[PDB]
Amino acid sequence: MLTNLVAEPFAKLEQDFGGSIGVYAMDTGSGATVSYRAEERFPLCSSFKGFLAAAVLARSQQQAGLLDTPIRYGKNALVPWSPISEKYLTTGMTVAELSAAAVQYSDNAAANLLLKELGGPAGLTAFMRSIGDTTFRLDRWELELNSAIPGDARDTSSPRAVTESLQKLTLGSALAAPQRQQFVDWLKGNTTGNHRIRAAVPADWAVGDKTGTCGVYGTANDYAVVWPTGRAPIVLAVYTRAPNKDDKHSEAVIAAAARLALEGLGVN
Numbered sequence: 001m002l003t004n005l006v007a008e009p010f011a012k013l014e015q016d017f018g019g020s021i022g023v024y025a026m027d028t029g030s031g032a033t034v035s036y037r038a039e040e041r042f043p044l045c046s047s048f049k050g051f052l053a054a055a056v057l058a059r060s061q062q063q064a065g066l067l068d069t070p071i072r073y074g075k076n077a078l079v080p081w082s083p084i085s086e087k088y089l090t091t092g093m094t095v096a097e098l099s100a101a102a103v104q105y106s107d108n109a110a111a112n113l114l115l116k117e118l119g120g121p122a123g124l125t126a127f128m129r130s131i132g133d134t135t136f137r138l139d140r141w142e143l144e145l146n147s148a149i150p151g152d153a154r155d156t157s158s159p160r161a162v163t164e165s166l167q168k169l170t171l172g173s174a175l176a177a178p179q180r181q182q183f184v185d186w187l188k189g190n191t192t193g194n195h196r197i198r199a200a201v202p203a204d205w206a207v208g209d210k211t212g213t214c215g216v217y218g219t220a221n222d223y224a225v226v227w228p229t230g231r232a233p234i235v236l237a238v239y240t241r242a243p244n245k246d247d248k249h250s251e252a253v254i255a256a257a258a259r260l261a262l263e264g265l266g267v268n
């Protein structure tokens with residue numbers, strides 16, 4: 001009955017935001033879920049970079065030494081918003097450093113370099129299929145994947161699919177034991193999400209998260225694995241979009257939807 005408990009709060013929040021909010025939250029030590037537009041497609045924006053790092057980790061379980069491989073790249077690999085890879089242009093970075101850069105700073109050149117190693121957007125989509133995710137699709141590279149065009153299913157997933165895949169990758173069996181904790185650690189070190197899901201959780205909770213911000217169509221998001229102290233983890237995804245290209249995204253709307261979700265689950 002949790003979903004019904006939050007139906008009207010969510011609807012009014014999305015009315016004042018002026019767009020659509022999609023939320024899926026899951027209590028793993030209870031089974032409880034909260035859903036609002038959880039099956040609708042939303043643009044992933046940079047939030048695909050979390051799964052990108054997971055796909056790299058998965059591949060590292062077969063290709064020994066993959067994480068320490070040095071990757072050298074030219075100025076032409078640089079793309080707007082590559083704050084980490086800009087600084088190692090003259091030296092190269094390892095696959096693990098690119099992965100951490102993609103997760104924790106949304107580094108765009110790092111994301112494209114890793115996508116190339118994985119076989120492009122189809123390679124990443126393939127990895128997500130391999131863990132049971134039939135919704136996720138990545139179709140383009142940075143920065144074209146951010147167009148967030150209304151009705152366009154390219155480079156989208158659903159809040160529900162994002163949460164289910166995140167749970168499999170951070171808490172379940174989709175990744176081997178060291179890779180899973182490495183993924184968690186990268187998510188925990190994220191620097192871009194202080195005003196989204198992290199803003200809605202108590203200071204003593206551990207949090208790993210990945211953000212996405214398309215820059216257009218009021219489209220922005222965050223997904224997170226959240227550890228209440230001494231309790232079982234909560235996994236959740238908050239995705240927004242709006243009808244007009246010039247509509248602005250709201251970090252506060254995302255934090256508000258996270259808090260609503262956690263209160264709906266009864267654990268806030």
Ligand SMILES: O=C(c1cccc(C(F)(F)F)c1)N1C[C@@H](c2nnn[nH]2)c2ccccc21
Pocket residue numbers: 046080081105106108192211212213
């Ligand atoms: O251009 C930006 C950026 C940089 C600084 C400040 C801001 C502000 F506007 F917030 F102040 C935005 N970024 C930030 C980064 C991101 N990752 N997840 N959300 N945004 C990202 C990913 C892909 C393309 C561009 C970008």
